[PDB]
Design an enzyme around this catalytic site. Structure first.
Site, PDB file in Angstrom:
ATOM      1  CD  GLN D   1      -3.014   1.078   0.131  1.00 41.37           C
ATOM      2  OE1 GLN D   1      -3.591  -0.087  -0.101  1.00 41.37           O
ATOM      3  NE2 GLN D   1      -3.055   2.108  -0.814  1.00 41.37           N
TER       4      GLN D   1
ATOM      5  CB  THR E   1      -0.596  -1.274   5.246  1.00 38.89           C
ATOM      6  OG1 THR E   1      -1.068  -2.189   4.402  1.00 38.89           O
ATOM      7  CG2 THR E   1       0.889  -1.311   4.870  1.00 38.89           C
ATOM      8  CD  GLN E   2      -4.187   2.943   9.086  1.00 41.80           C
ATOM      9  OE1 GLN E   2      -3.970   2.273  10.221  1.00 41.80           O
ATOM     10  NE2 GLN E   2      -4.793   4.134   9.116  1.00 41.80           N
ATOM     11  CG  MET E 107       7.009   1.604   5.739  1.00 46.42           C
ATOM     12  SD  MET E 107       7.385   0.715   4.322  1.00 46.42           S
ATOM     13  CE  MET E 107       8.026  -0.395   4.907  1.00 46.42           C
TER      14      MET E 107
END
Lengths: 250, 212, 245, 222, 233, 243, 242, 198
Positions: D1, E1-2, E107
């Site tokens: 991401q 993550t998002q 991260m």
């Protein structure tokens, strides 16, 4: 801050002895008369039941514990040391053998596993060593019925009958004379009540004897009433009424 | 990048480019390409710039530390083998190195070890290393002669670099020359490729017997 | 903390000794006896079990005889408990040599490790050492039959006849005389049993107060087959020498 | 991401001269087409005749700088207020840069000042490590446009005087502080037109042994 | 993550001569469903700082706790502390930023973008931005989310250099904030009809008008009816 | 055993006091810093035909600008040197330049504090403090020639001359009279030999003494056996002509 | 935690534990090394009183540390294995890393260093061993002889003797060696070594074990047969000087 | 890869290993050899990735050499091949294997029998009278099986190996420019200088 204790608390004295083992043994001599007999047609172990109080349950009280299914143990010494030790013995016996070789540890192999616990505890500081002696009476289908002694240090030796506690030597004399192998289990129960009546005076009953045998089977001790797949337990603890029935049987 | 070393009668001739670019237009003719280990030991920057910068200065420190510790001059060999052990641990996570550890020690003579990112350690006598290696070796080879004096030896090192600089777009700003002697290394200047090209074309007759 | 709640007995002494080690040898000198006779077609091993009864099993005749391999075994003089940790770990130390090089450990390597662990318990940690002395009954093809003893101090010495335990002194004085420098197993067996009776007080020497093992070359058994004599084979040999008295 | 890494533009220029050195930078700060700042000092005095600019991506600049500011402080304490050398500071940065590369950095750092033997010095860095000393170094986004002029007029490279232009040339003169400033204003005024990463203001820090001197010239505002 | 599932959009700000103004809708979005209407997203930290947080609500809740702990830890070491060594705008912002940078650098990032507005009680105006990418900057006008795009060009006509700051008054300042926000509700529907707005004064401390509602209504759309439901068969 | 945190009624730790007792039993180390160098001299002592007396010396080099001479236990001075080399090497890599002699002494003194049972302030891994005191001599480009006395207690003082060892009480007393502020490197070395002769119960040879010097065109330099002996040869004749 | 004290100061500026380590060495057997200017001789006792030892698996006193380097000792065997192991590893560590055969000085520094650590560091005690380390540096024909104590200190010595009656063997040796004229031939330097070590072993000529080290890995252990011959000779020499 | 052949003849164990590194037209180096003496009668030759090679090679060498001094005893070639295998079979799980295929050529001085070990990077160890790795074996096994059958001398092996190498450089498009050959037998290790028809 926090502990720093790593110095051994068991140390040698000028004679070659080990102070802590000597002390611990005094406790064991003063502990409850326990014996073990191999009847050759079984193994019968008996120990003194006691009560704290008449208003106290002695169901909870632990004087005979099943270490593994076919094996029982009894002791003279220090009760609290016994209770924890039984626990570490049960745990390792279950994890390390009961689906690894697919069955319980053999008696001699289990005596060595106890022996090790006690010896770790004697070598290492932060803790004092166990103060106990056990009589491990057993059956394993690859050694028959056995009797061992486990000492406080973890020294062990094989026996075919013995007694430890108070009033041992004379208890062994009566047992030596009455039993010399090839004997019914029932008969060994009778001999055992007789040895202990002479050993304990003041008040005597079968409600102050707690008796276990390894030396029977029921379908109920395969743990199922169907079609066999394995043999299962042979440990059976008797109830007080059954013991009074054997006290009535001459 | 085309970076080279040869062992010959006089010592070792180390010849190198310097060239930094913004696009293909050569912004400055000066980039680091020679990392100075110690006063007699050179190691070349190439491959992972950052990996080379950090670890060859590091190498220089540990060498200085050996001279305290054991009171002995280091081998080029001892130097290389330390580097390689560390290089192999950080592999598979990055780390890239292209160096040749060059020195002239009293306890071995002129000595060259080749060291790469994968952890090979190789000794030879003639090296060109680069991506212009094959062509540069051609020029080197046909006028090679171990016996030879320092002056001619230098001009040959320089001609191999220009030959390489012309075909490939990864060298040619100016050419830096170093002679590694017994008592330490001697800089011989930066040669403008612009003035140098015209001389070499007429002179060598190599790829140029009939000029092209 | 622990400074004034503990002591230091793992320090040196004003003779150069360590308190607990010197003492450890004492513990061994009143423990049961182990004897090692090395022959040149075999190894003869004898041990006295001091005190035996008809309430103890005498049937278990591995009580001081443990096989650590099918080529090395020890005879124990000192405690069962102390013994147990070094046996189990020695057997493990074996398997490691065996896995790595596909060949069994020599006797000498395995002794040197054992001794280093035992030195270790007085050398750091503050711990106590073991109180058991081992007689190594062993093989090499570099050294023939091998006979060692190692101690809680971790010193180890090569032998062809040794004793540790009680009555050490009596056995060794008769043994040095009656020794033959190269000898067969059966001769060894005669010599051993002869020595044994006269180191055991009054009439007592029996099969069931003895543990016997012999390590023979054989020719219906394999090269270096250890036979750990069970009661009945002790009974036989006693009658043959006639020494049961 | 997720990768925070981008660009934020800006332009810096370092020139080593005869006794002096400059670190000139525009004061415009962007992210794409939006204006982040129209004044934000893009040359900053770290102390000790060392002025420093990490052009590229902002997020790494701020970090690189904070690590280094605490090193300037620790060097003083631990060595009784002994002032930090341009070369030593450059080594200290090398180790910082090299300390993260598992999270890699995207900055063009340039330091300018004086070395301790008294010659102007400018050092240029590569984003994951390395430094080398240069005479002149244009930096940042508009590096590629500034350098080709600079090379003629300061450094006298690809510059030859009408004759044969090959054995006749124009020679090297170390410039004056006045003459350098003219050059720098000219570069930057041309630069504003052509780049939206240059404009707003021009801060020149000129660094001398009389201290750090500040000059300010105005540039284009939309 | 998002990646987002819950959003808050738009916190706008400006400097005037003797304070700052900041205004923000009150919002917890679940996309285009206005799920939580009324969620705090001006957090007064003391009476001299207001923290505006835009971006993911899941992240916003965590900072919301962290600021309330900063007040509790700012009462530690002396209870009457409010310009002695605690409770200044620069302190609250540097604290947030150190966490912000650390999380992105590994991260697993804080997915917010922050505007710290306040007036130091030791100095002059404070206005500074920080985002999820680790880029931080200062300017006399600042906006997050939609408001960066749309409100900020309106802001710049009043103040955008130092020199224009003494020349803006409370009234001129307040008129720009009230204009800007009307624009934010008009072109972007996420932004809630209720907002809270706070003016942070040197002259009178903290004035926070909570739960104020857009007014001076547009109904301009009514001119352009060519129908959309008005049917004649 | 003995407390590691238990002070005297004055407030001076037992362990510190005991540290001071081992120091006093080594052979003298004497330094004079001058304006052209630092001289460090030691009595090496022992002369035997079953001894290699010119293979052992008490003046060891840390760096190309730093030495130390010691007095007290020599085994202890090996751990101090291992720590000191590592710290100096890592600083030369980071900033490219010389480490300060005062700076070095503080880094070492920090690890001199561990002994005994641990703390919650510090993890005390050792058992005793170090039983050697040191004269560390060097050069730096920002304070020139210097001489430093590190005590294992924690205190380190800069000096222009200082003697340590067994025979320090006499030695120091001589140092002061001989010391002046126009003293040079060449005079200082001759004088060292005078002091050493006086306090010996033997003839001064280079198999019982060793000289060393610092010049900043060569760093820390050992005055070799061959040169030290030539200096001894010159001494004996000149002294033995003042009588 | 067992990083706390186990070695403490003396009030005299010694250390109690180091003074007690040296005593164990004295009670012990005797080892000696005498130098020529072509060899370095090491004598080591094997005084087997008892005849029930089998002596091919009875531990030796000679270890390789390296192919051109030997270590001999007097002291507890148990402790000495632990030191001997760490010293072999260190020779191979240099060999691997520097691409160079090992130099004697650095090894001595290493042997010194582990013993030195264990006095300084807490919850460990020093070894019960003193050693002699000797050998030859690479491409070098001059002898090297080092002595290390479990204090951790170290020195070079032209000759040194350790263990029981160290006084007696130093005192003798001092009359039979000069640094200006040390022996050139193996036979006479060995004769001297066997003669010193005769005088303290009592009876011994199979109980004395000689190993003579010539430059770079020519290391040869003389045998009983050979030794009995030198002892005969010594009994002829002692009635030529009567 | 790197063409490494081994043939175990009657009197000795012959290993053939490439002699040059070719860059373009011409051999930059043609003085190559890659073998390490483990012990005076245990030899290991090496093929694979060129940096995995030196790193493994010196690691294994170091361990076996520590055992030699320690015990003052030479170890068997069998001893070494079990050792090499185990170590490979730990690394093949790990995330950075070696990719090195070895042949260890030894004379077992303790059986008095010759032994040849071919060990894959996987840890597949096999004792063989001849072997090859990779695409080499397709051309050379077809000669070896037909023209050679067990119980042939040193001289016979030399000629056989030459024939093999000549077909590999012609007909197989890998180029490695011949082999220089070494013999491991009872009396240790020699490099057979000749390569004209041997």
């Amino acid at each position: 801050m926090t502990d720093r204790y790593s110095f051994s608390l068991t140390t040698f004295s000028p004679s070659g002895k080990l102070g802590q083992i000597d002390y611990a043994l005094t406790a064991v001599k003063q502990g409850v008369t326990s014996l073990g007999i191999k009847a050759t047609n079984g193994v019968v172990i008996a120990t003194e039941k006691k009560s704290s109080s008449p208003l106290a349950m002695s169901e909870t009280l632990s004087k005979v514990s099943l270490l593994t299914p076919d094996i029982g143990a009894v002791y003279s010494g220090m009760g609290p040391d016994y209770r924890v030790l039984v626990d570490k013995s049960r745990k390792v016996a279950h994890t390390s053998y009961k689906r690894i070789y697919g069955e319980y540890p053999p008696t001699k192999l289990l005596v060595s596993e106890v022996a090790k616990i006690m010896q770790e505890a004697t070598q290492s500081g932060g803790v004092r060593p166990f103060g106990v002696s056990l009589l491990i009476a057993g059956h394993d289908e690859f050694n028959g019925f056995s009797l061992y002694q486990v000492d406080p240090s973890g020294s062990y030796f094989p026996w075919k009958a013995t007694a430890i506690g108070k009033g041992s030597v004379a208890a062994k004399t009566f047992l030596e004379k009455r039993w010399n192998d090839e004997l019914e289990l029932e008969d060994a129960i009778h001999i055992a009540l007789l040895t202990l009546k002479e050993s304990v005076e003041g008040e005597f009953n079968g409600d102050t004897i707690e008796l276990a045998i390894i030396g029977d089977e029921n379908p109920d001790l395969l743990g199922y009433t169907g079609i066999p797949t394995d043999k299962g337990p042979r440990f059976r603890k008797l109830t007080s009424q059954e013991i009074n029935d054997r006290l009535e049987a001459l | 990048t085309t970076t080279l070393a040869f062992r010959f009668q006089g010592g070792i001739i180390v010849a190198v480019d310097s060239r930094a670019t913004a696009g293909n237009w050569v912004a400055s003719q000066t980039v680091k390409r020679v990392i100075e280990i110690n006063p007699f030991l050179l190691g070349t920057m190439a491959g992972g710039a950052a990996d080379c910068q950090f670890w060859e200065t590091w190498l220089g420190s540990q060498c200085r530390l050996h001279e305290l510790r054991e009171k002995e001059r280091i081998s080029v060999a001892a130097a290389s083998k330390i580097l390689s052990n560390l290089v192999y641990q950080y592999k598979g996570a990055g780390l890239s190195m292209g160096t040749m550890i060059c020195g002239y020690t009293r306890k071995e003579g002129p000595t060259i070890y080749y060291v790469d990112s994968d952890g090979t350690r190789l000794k030879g006598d003639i090296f060109c290393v680069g991506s212009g290696q094959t062509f540069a070796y051609g020029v080197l080879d046909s006028n090679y002669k171990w016996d030879l004096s320092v002056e001619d030896a230098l001009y040959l090192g320089k001609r191999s670099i220009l030959a390489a600089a012309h075909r490939d777009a990864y060298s040619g700003g100016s050419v830096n020359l170093y002679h590694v002697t017994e008592d330490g290394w001697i800089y011989h200047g930066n040669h403008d490729v612009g003035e140098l090209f015209w001389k070499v074309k007429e002179e060598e007759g190599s790829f140029n017997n009939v000029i092209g | 903390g622990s400074r004034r709640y503990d002591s230091r007995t793992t320090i040196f002494s004003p003779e150069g000794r360590l308190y607990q080690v010197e003492y450890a040898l004492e513990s061994i000198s009143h423990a049961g006896t182990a004897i090692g006779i090395m022959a040149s077609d075999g190894i003869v091993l004898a041990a006295e079990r001091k005190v035996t009864s008809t309430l103890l099993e005498q049937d278990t005749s591995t009580e001081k005889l443990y096989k650590l391999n099918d080529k090395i075994a020890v005879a124990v003089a000192g405690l069962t408990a102390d013994a147990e940790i070094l046996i189990n770990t020695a057997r493990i130390h074996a398997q490691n040599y065996l896995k790595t090089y596909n060949e069994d450990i020599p006797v000498e390597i395995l002794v040197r490790r054992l001794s280093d662990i035992k030195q270790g318990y007085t050398q750091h940690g503050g711990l106590r050492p073991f109180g058991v002395s081992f007689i190594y009954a062993g093989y090499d093809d570099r050294y023939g039959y091998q006979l060692y003893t190692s101690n809680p101090s971790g010193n180890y010495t090569g032998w062809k006849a040794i004793s540790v335990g009680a009555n050490t002194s009596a056995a060794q004085t008769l043994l040095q005389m009656d020794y033959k420098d190269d000898m067969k197993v059966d001769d060894a067996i005669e010599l051993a049993l002869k020595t044994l009776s006269k180191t055991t007080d009054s009439s007592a020497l029996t099969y069931d107060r003895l543990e016997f093992a012999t390590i023979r070359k054989g020719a219906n058994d394999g090269e270096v087959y250890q036979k750990i004599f069970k009661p009945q084979e002790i009974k036989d040999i006693l009658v043959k020498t006639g020494i049961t008295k | 991401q997720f990768n925070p890494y981008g660009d934020n533009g800006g332009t810096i220029l370092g020139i080593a001269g005869e006794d002096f050195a400059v670190l000139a930078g525009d004061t415009r700060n962007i992210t794409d087409y939006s204006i982040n700042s129209r004044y934000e000092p893009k040359v900053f005095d770290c102390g000790d005749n060392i002025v420093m600019s990490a052009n590229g991506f902002a997020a790494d600049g701020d970090a690189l700088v904070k690590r280094f500011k605490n090193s300037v402080k620790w060097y003083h304490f631990d060595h009784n207020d002994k002032k930090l050398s341009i070369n030593s500071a450059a080594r200290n940065i090398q180790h910082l840069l090299y300390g993260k590369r598992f999270f890699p950095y995207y900055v063009h750092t340039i330091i300018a000042g004086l070395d301790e033997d008294g010659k102007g010095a400018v050092y240029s860095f590569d984003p994951v490590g390395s430094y080398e000393r240069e005479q002149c170094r244009a930096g940042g986004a508009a590096a590629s446009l500034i350098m080709p002029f600079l090379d003629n007029q300061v450094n006298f490279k690809n510059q030859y005087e009408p004759g044969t232009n090959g054995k006749v040339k124009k020679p090297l003169k170390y410039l004056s502080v006045e003459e350098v400033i003219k050059l720098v204003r000219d570069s930057f005024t041309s630069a504003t037109e052509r780049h939206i990463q240059v404009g707003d203001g021009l801060e020149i820090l000129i660094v001398t042994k009389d201290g750090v001197r500040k000059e300010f010239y105005e540039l284009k505002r939309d | 993550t998002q990646q987002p599932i819950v959003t808050g959009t738009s916190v706008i700000s400006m400097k005037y001569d003797n304070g700052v103004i900041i205004a923000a809708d009150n919002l917890g979005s679940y996309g285009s469903l206005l799920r939580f209407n009324g969620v705090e997203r001006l957090i007064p930290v003391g009476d001299n700082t207001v923290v505006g947080i835009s971006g993911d609500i899941s992240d916003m809740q965590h900072i919301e706790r962290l600021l309330k702990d900063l007040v509790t830890e700012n009462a530690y070491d002396n209870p009457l502390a409010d310009a002695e060594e605690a409770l200044e705008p620069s302190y609250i912002f540097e604290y947030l930023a150190t966490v912000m940078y650390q999380r992105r650098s590994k991260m697993n990032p804080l997915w917010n973008a922050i505007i710290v507005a306040g007036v130091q009680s030791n100095g002059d105006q404070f206005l500074r931005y920080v985002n999820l990418l680790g880029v931080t900057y200062s300017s006399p006008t600042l906006a997050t989310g939609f408001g960066a795009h749309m409100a900020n060009p309106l802001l710049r006509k009043v103040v955008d250099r130092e020199s224009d700051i003494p020349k803006t008054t409370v009234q001129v300042a307040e008129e720009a904030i009230v204009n800007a926000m009307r624009v934010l509700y008009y072109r972007d529907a996420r932004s809630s009809r209720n907002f809270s707005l706070a003016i942070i004064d040197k002259n009178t401390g903290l004035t926070f008008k909570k739960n104020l509602q857009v007014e001076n209504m547009k109904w301009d759309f009514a001119k352009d009816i060519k129908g959309y439901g008005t049917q004649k068969i | 055993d003995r407390g590691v945190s238990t002070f005297s009624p004055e407030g001076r730790l037992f362990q510190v006091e005991y540290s001071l007792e081992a120091i006093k039993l080594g052979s003298t180390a004497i330094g004079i810093a001058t304006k052209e160098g630092v001289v460090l001299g030691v009595e090496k002592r022992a002369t035997s035909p079953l001894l290699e007396s010119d293979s052992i010396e008490k003046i060891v080099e840390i760096d190309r600008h730093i030495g130390c001479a010691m007095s007290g236990l020599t085994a202890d001075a090996r751990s101090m040197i291992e720590h000191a080399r590592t710290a100096a090497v890592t600083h030369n890599l980071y900033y490219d330049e010389d480490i300060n002699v005062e700076s070095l002494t503080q880094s070492v003194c920090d690890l001199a504090l561990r002994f005994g049972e641990g703390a919650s302030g510090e993890e005390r891994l050792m058992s005793r403090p170090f039983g050697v005191a040191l004269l560390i001599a060097g050069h730096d480009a920002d304070d020139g020639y210097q001489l430093f006395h590190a005590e294992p207690s924690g205190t380190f003082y800069r000096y222009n001359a200082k003697a340590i060892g067994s025979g320090s009480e006499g030695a120091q007393a001589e140092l002061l009279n001989e010391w002046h502020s126009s003293l040079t490197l060449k005079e200082a070395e001759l004088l060292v030999l005078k002091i050493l002769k006086q306090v010996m119960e033997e003839k001064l040879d280079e198999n019982n003494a060793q000289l060393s010097c610092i010049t900043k065109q060569d760093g820390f330099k050992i005055y070799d056996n061959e040169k030290t002996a030539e200096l001894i040869k010159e001494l004996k004749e000149k002294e033995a002509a003042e009588s | 935690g067992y990083d706390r004290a186990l070695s403490i100061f003396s009030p005299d500026g010694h250390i109690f534990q180091v003074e007690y380590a040296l005593e164990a060495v004295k009670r012990g057997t005797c080892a000696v090394g005498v130098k020529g200017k072509n060899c370095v001789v090491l004598g080591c006792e094997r005084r087997s009183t008892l005849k029930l030892q089998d002596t091919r698996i009875t531990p030796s006193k000679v270890s390789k540390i390296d192919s051109h380097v030997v270590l001999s000792f007097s002291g507890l065997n148990a402790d000495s294995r632990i030191l001997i192991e760490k010293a072999r590893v260190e020779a191979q560590s240099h060999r691997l890393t520097l691409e160079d055969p090992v130099t004697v000085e650095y090894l001595t520094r290493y042997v010194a260093g582990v013993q030195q650590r264990y006095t300084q560091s807490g919850g460990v005690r020093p070894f019960g061993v003193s050693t002699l380390i000797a050998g030859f540096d690479p491409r070098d024909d001059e002898p090297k002889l080092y002595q290390t104590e479990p204090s951790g200190i170290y020195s070079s010595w032209s000759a040194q003797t350790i263990g029981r009656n160290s006084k007696t063997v130093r005192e003798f040796l001092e009359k039979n060696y000069d640094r200006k004229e040390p022996p050139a031939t193996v036979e006479e330097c060995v004769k001297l070594t066997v003669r010193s070590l005769l005088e303290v072993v009592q009876t011994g000529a199979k109980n004395i074990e000689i190993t003579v080290v010539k430059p770079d890995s020519d290391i040869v252990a003389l045998s009983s047969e050979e030794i009995n011959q030198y002892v005969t000779q010594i009994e002829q020499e002692k009635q030529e000087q009567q | 890869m790197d063409i490494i052949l081994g043939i175990r003849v009657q009197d000795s164990v012959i290993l053939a290993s490439s002699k040059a590194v070719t860059r373009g037209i011409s051999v930059l180096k043609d003085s190559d050899d890659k073998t390490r003496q483990l012990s005076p009668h245990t030899l290991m030759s090496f093929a694979g990735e060129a940096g995995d090679t030196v790193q493994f090679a010196e690691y294994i060498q170091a361990n076996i050499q520590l055992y030699s001094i320690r015990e003052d005893y030479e170890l068997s070639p069998q001893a070494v091949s079990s050792f090499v295998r185990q170590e490979l079979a730990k690394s093949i799980r790990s995330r950075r294997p070696y990719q090195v295929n070895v042949l260890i050529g030894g004379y077992d001085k303790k059986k008095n029998k010759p032994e040849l070990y071919q060990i894959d990077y996987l840890g597949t160890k096999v004792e063989l009278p001849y072997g090859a790795h990779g695409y080499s074996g397709f051309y050379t096994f077809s000669l070896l099986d037909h023209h050679y059958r067990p119980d042939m001398t040193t001289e016979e092996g030399l000629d056989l190996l030459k024939l093999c190498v000549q077909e590999l450089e012609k007909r197989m498009p890998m180029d490695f420019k011949g082999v220089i050959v070494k013999i491991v037998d009872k009396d240790g290790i020699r490099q057979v200088d000749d390569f004209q028809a041997q």
